[PDB]
């Protein structure tokens with residue numbers, strides 16, 4: 001029989017995904033994360049398995065995929081996905097529990113941008129990698145590793161591009177991600193979903209929101225802000241597309257950038273990156289590769 005799910009023992013319930021239940025399990029003596037889907041969720045399981053098996057996807061800042069498998073308990077079949085386990089869990093959880101140093105903030109922002117740049121990058125060759133857009137980037141979908149760096153997770157809603165024909169591998173539905181992090185063009189449905197670059201640009205808007213969440217938690221001289229989700233000051237919990245659209249598209253508001261972020265170079269660099277991810281016009285936003293370059297130049301300066 002099989003050598004994956006058969007030999008894994010579930011230990012602790014982690015929580016529920018969009019589809020699938022998440023667990024901490026033990027495989028060959030090591031801790032692993034397991035996501036379990038029912039038979040009726042096969043389409044969601046298969047699509048996530050497909051994204052994680054993309055040629056050349058592996059990267060230090062992308063969740064490490066182990067395997068897709070099935071497990072029959074004698075009554076029903078379970079569809080499994082197995083990955084590396086990260087004890088800190090999400091960046092959302094990490095930022096709620098802790099404050100970070102200037103060094104800590106740059107490590108989190110650089111690692112996030114490096115993972116997104118890798119996802120977004122097309123690699124030519126026999127073992128080429130297609131460009132991939134996430135479509136649901138948020139702090140709850142980024143995990144924090146023991147070394148204080150991030151890895152991008154929740155790849156189930158991703159879209160992949162074929163550069164030669166300029167085609168996207170699936171027929172994309174509108175507004176699939178988390179409403180709070182939807183880019184202006186997604187909220188007002190002006191996004192041209194036939195152009196792959198549109199999805200990459202919408203991911204950068206969401207990454208800007210995540211950088212704002214991190215920067216709030218950066219403590220200098222014991223001074224920092226409390227943890228908040230972006231737009232906590234303007235929309236209810238679980239906002240609708242309409243509530244977000246009125247704020248982001250009509251009133252044209254963005255998360256507030258505090259005055260204290262101008263007192264420190266690292267916070268001035270982060271604040272400038274945010275403003276340049278938040279442009280209503282996606283074509284004006286920075287690329288993930290440009291952000292990675294800016295933050296790498298900053299990490300080198302701070303001696304991280």
Ligand SMILES: COc1ccc(-c2c(-c3ccnc(NC(C)=O)c3)[nH]c3cccnc23)nc1
Nearest residue numbers: 014017022033034035081082083085086087089
């Ligand atoms: C390809 O296989 C997987 C397996 C698990 C997850 C996954 C994880 C996950 C991963 C690693 N470590 C942890 N660690 C702590 C402490 O939660 C949690 N959290 C989630 C929440 C919702 C949906 N999926 C997930 N994704 C993909």
